[PDB]
Amino acid sequence: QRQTQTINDSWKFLKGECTAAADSAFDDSKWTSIHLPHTWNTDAYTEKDYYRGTGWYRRQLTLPQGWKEKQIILRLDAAGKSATIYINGKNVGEHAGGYTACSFNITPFLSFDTPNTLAVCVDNARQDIAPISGDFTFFGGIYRDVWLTAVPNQHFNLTNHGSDGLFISTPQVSEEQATLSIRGEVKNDAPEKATLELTHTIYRPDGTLLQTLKKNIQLKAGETYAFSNEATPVLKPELWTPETPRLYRVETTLRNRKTKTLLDQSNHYTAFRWFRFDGDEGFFLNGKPYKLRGICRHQDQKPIGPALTDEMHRRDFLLMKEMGANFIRISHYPQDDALLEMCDKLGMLAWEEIPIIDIVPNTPGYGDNCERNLREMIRQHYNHPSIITWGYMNEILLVTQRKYKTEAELKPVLERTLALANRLERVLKEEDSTRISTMAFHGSNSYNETGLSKITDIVGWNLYQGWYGGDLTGFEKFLAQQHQNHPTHPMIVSEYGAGSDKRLHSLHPRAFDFSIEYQQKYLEHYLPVLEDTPYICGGTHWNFIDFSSALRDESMPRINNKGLVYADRTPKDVYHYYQAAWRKDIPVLHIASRDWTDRAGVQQGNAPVYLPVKIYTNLSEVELFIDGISLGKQKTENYTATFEVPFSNRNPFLFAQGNYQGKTVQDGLRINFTPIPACLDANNLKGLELAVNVGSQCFFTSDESQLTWLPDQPYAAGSWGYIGGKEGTAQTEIQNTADGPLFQTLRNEIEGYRFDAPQGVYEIELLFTDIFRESTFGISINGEVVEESLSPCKESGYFRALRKKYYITNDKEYIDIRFHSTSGTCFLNGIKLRNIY
Template sequence: MNKRSLLPLFMLLAVAMPSEAQRITQTLNSNWEFHLGNESMQPADSNAAGWTWITVPHTWNTQDTEDDEPGYYRGTGWYKKKLYIPSGWKDKDIYLFFNGVAQQADVYINGKPAGSHKGGYTAFCIPASAYLSYKAGAANELLIKADNSENETIPPLSGDFTFFGGIYRDVQVIALNKVHFNMGDHGSGGVFITTPTVSAEQASVTIRGSFVNNSGQRKELTLTHRLTDAAGMTIAQDTIVYHVNPGEKTAFLRNMNVAHPRLWSPDAPYLYRISAQLTDRHTGKILDEVVNPLGFRWYRFDAAKGFFLNGKPLKLIGTSRHQDYAGMGNALSRAMHIHDVELLKQMGGNFLRIAHYPQDPAVIEACDRLGILASVETPVVNRISESEDFARNALNMHLEMIRQNFNHPSLIIWAYMNEVLLRPRYEKGSPEQEAYFKKITSLARKLELLTRKEDPYRYTLIPNHADFDLYNRLQLTKIPMLVGWNCYQGWYTGNFKDFERFVEWHHRELPQKPLLITEYGADADNRLHSSSPVRFDKTVEYATAYHRAYLETIRSKPFIAGAVIWNLADFSSETRAESTPHINSKGVLTMDRKVKDAYRFYQANLLKTPYLHIGSPEWDLRAGIARPGNKPVCTQPVQVFSNQEEIVLKLNGQTLGTAKPRSGIAVFQVPFINGPNLLQAASGDGKVTDQATIDFQIIPTRLNDKDLPFTSLNVNLGDQRYFYDPADHEIWLPEKEYAKGSWGYIGGHVFKKKDSRVAYGSDKNMLGTGLDPVYATQREGIKQFKMDVPDGVYTITLHFAELHSPRQHETLVYNLSGSEAAPDHFSVRTFNVDINGGPFLSPLSNQQYMVPERAVSFTTTVSAQQNKGITIVFTPIEGEPVLNGIQVRKIY
């Protein structure tokens, strides 16, 4: 059997057995005090004023990453708590275990430096015994200096995600017998398990690790490894005796064989348990014990045929995941981490790319239990520093990542250097840049060599952005065992067919290199909808079309071993703007884990159980213009997601028709009526059903229609999308040109920034508002806006924003297109606004109220008389008049 094709199966985090093994593990998450800033503070100053009570996990960046102020705090934060050590622990070895502190930590115990760590995404362990007081009732002071400052020696240096600061994962105190498994091995549990050979008939298990004797006495120790099945029955056992001198660290390497193992797979993630136990041979006392889950399976990647698990082909389909949540930053509970993996499983996914850094151990543990294959990667993202310190820290982080995640049956890939050539340093083609490129290649080789040495069984991967020639020239397609491409054709650039051409290019140029699509996705703002979506409009419908096109190509190409959606959920990216400022909205879930249609699309395509769901039920308030006819109705498309052969849709109890889903989607043209509309969908056999209630607002074709009285209207100028504002429960319609008896604009043109990738509007963060889609689009040069409303009294709100700005913005760094920001041609804009012949805004100027990039609105009351309706006139003084949005509501 080819060892390269076999999977090592193991789990890192040891499960303690305190009643027997005398190992005690306690969380230290409660009753911390926190002090932000004050980089000059010393441990002796810990009693200074300005401390607040907090609970760990904690980050100091929950608010400043979401506000309109550019940037967020990257600096120092201090944490302290009182630690009470039982007097009975004085004969134990005591450690402090930190699962994650961003991104540099200095630990002080009772005012003395006890240890430090660089890297915000891997765990570290601090020996604490020598610094503690064991007197009854004595309070030990634990003080942590955390620092998430920009540091050219610590990866990551940049990335399309927020670098939160703080002690954002669990902290534990661990008390052990003086004889115990090695706690000083890069934050690992000191025991490492592999399965060098696995088949349905036979499996071998290798267990290696080390233990220490800090007792001060020579010990005769028994080391026992016991393999048990899920029911607790012993399957195999190995015992050996060691004679160990005081202060000695002892390495061990043991082997077992198992006949007819039950195999681990996504459909049946069967886990065994393997314990490692140290006992005193003379007294029989258990000194230390750790337990790790173990799964048996084998796998391989084939450049032509894809991925195989336990000898059977399996297309890997899943998502990547960032570790933050709306309003909480990255300070999540274990339950929240686990729930994300559950959501991936409920979507039908079988693969998780843990990116762009190692995450809470609860994530990979959940993958083991739920049957989600996984990759994990070190946080060398976008670029490197050329210093030796950076290389040393990158290699150390990589080693910590491997040792700490070694014993997980779900983990099949070690990855590093995501999109490391996206924004290279120095001038293109310069000698300095070529030297920089050589540093990148050299570091890649070192990371690869380290990985192969540590783990000769798992595969290695570099995820690249789609600059094929550059990565290929620098050998980054050749150094790792797998190549990953982050593909956004049809989003940042090009069209859907470009994606198919790109993967075929890879297969043609690198026919022996297995391929994964390590990223693909499109932003989707759940508030934006369109029946004619276009690239980069951020509508739910475009994102669904994008995923449909990609999945069809992925499934049709056997050489694509797997594909990973970017991302499971929307995540924080403080520098981003557009319709969801500070958020990358490519998730198939929102940042607070609400479902998008793309998630439903994958459920319809991946789930093996019957599935049916009406699309966009959260868009429960819709509007449109009545079509001509006796009965006021407005026909709009509705998508139904299902894996059933045939779908029947009813509206208010009446059957609209049947449709056969294509790629999991059936589309129906629904004639909505004014008011509540009950949609009922069912499979052809009636066994699978779903329903949704849509409140529809019919806008009359002629506003003075007595059978359908006019009530209100919200129009988003310069836009062809529907915008649903759930906060105010309002629906905004796309603009249209004025027609007699109706409403609309007269004159002008849609705002579009020159050389911008967006179809219309601005990609800036509109300040002072949550209605970014309204203020980011406008009609320039507008002459009038007319509404032939019936006589009555109305409130009118006009919305404005100056979309040009004297402040130059850098283009989005992570658009993967390499384009630079086009100049922003800002100039003075002044105009008057009259309503029904009377002055309203005289004048309005971007030198006064209309501050660039900031929302401004004005509301007034208007009387429509003598069947003349409402006419708003825009008169230029300097530059062109603009209008971003208008709201009209009849009072009486």
């Protein structure tokens, strides 16, 4: 019989090279105790320069005596980026690739009456292994399951590109009938021949038997045997869709032909579906038009990296499925079996790819490792009915076009690129003729002009109009252009998204302020275009999660914040916009304010402060209440509705309801509101901490201090605000603060800041960061100099926070701060006023 179990436990780990670390008798007691899955790159969640290099893993293998006559296969499901396996000091094998499995028959190197030592040397510094470039962290270590499989001396091949050795397909599929094809290899590692019986048992979705195939076979000592048995056509077969994931189990059994002793067994699922892509009418599943509703998903989770356990992969999947998605771009690398098991069983169409990104370098051996990862991916994930397309390149021209400008420089790189591309297209269709090929392009017509877009069956456009420049309307314009010029290339929008940050909100959202509201604006424009345009087969949203990308700065450094859920898998409000549009079966009513629970605003006297509250819903009409008071009904358009809500009380309870298919549907939540006075006097100063996000139109709420910094406002008599200057913005990371975004916007060429305020003693905090890589200025308040010559970049350097507090005695009816430029410009990034006496 076959025994499969993990050996994820009882490991020792050492970061860095170490000579003698493979030896049986090496002393490792001072090493770190760990448990797989593991990564040594949690540093990538704070450090841009994460450790790329070597690390050593050691674990004892003490073999069970019942395995004395079995073959022992070791499987590493992934290790980034490469691994060399030692058993008792003997090199057993090596693997190149961070996202595909590898397996080794380790029987010869094992003892059965002594301890055996397993030692894995892992390296994520190697430049001959994909990816070498791309918008994510190249995490090092053994971050998927590690298995031991013991099998009898005759068994199915388990050392074919780390796969299961068996491959099931369906050559023909129609409403009326379909045909099955069960192929694989049997291996005999006994010293003598053997006569076997092979059995293929096929079960309907409902568990009952549909058919048994039997074929007797013989193998001589040390031979591997290739079979390929068609099956009786299945009549009126139950077809698979994401919505009806009908699966047929196929159980393949290997027994000794005389004694009928069971030897080895291996189960797989199969399904019956066909599909095509149409440059004019889109995607067709089982003959019917089918809009692909997709998201892409990276595999990491802050702060553990990609060392996820399998229930986390399943949790991720439940979230994408409850949102209503029917398609997933598994990108940019092949992901855990735990995930693909769910796309088959619970139902999701799948696109899977290997990470060849940005630029084909002239690195010796790169192309060859790429082709092996393509074969590994395809052979390992071949039996997953959910997968309908493989891909191998994503934006392969992006860095190439940035780094090479002349036609002379482009020439050799475009040739390398077009070569590797056609090569892999051939490797793909040689490994699998049942699925579609695909490539993903950044938003450039040069993928057409260079020839790259004639290569695959379908094309993916990564489109960011309205985020990385352009207009939101350029998105549908870019796609209509591609469709008139290239009407036979069927298109998927394989990427679109906008960053958001829970700390930032705006009544006037713009791109690259990273407010919750701009990302919503961007997605609310993109999604109907995807749903209502026939030559768009679908879109895959980039990305389902906020994910690790150590090289990024922007509002959340080390993080790509374009997710629909946060890194911990709490959903952003906009997740429920997708749900409203994609789940018609249930009611969706979501007050879109879980991202905006700590609100502030400038208050005229005692009048209520108006701030928008948004609702995502599939109901047609919704009514919103604040502390019991109705704010009327509103008809939904585009699954959304905004109310202008009067905030007053400090802990208001928001409540929404509406009718859906005859049932009443409700939602509610409490939030926090703090009014800030527009006109300071001695009463409203008690307990006031007036804090302004100078140079920005966003409310910034610290997640460290819970303080909200108000949008900048110009000075008006009776009130407070800035005098002169223009808004300035950076996306570079700011040292020495948790509150990056507050320092990344500033009022440049500022002339003053004024507070009309009563006489007294005041605490003034000034926030500076020089983002213009020289500025020197003096600061006076009510005619007294508080800085003679402040130069933030000479004190602290560029992109580094300075917070300076001053105690100020106001003997006037105002607090007038003036800036006196002497070099460069005057700038101010934030200001906070408190009355002390």
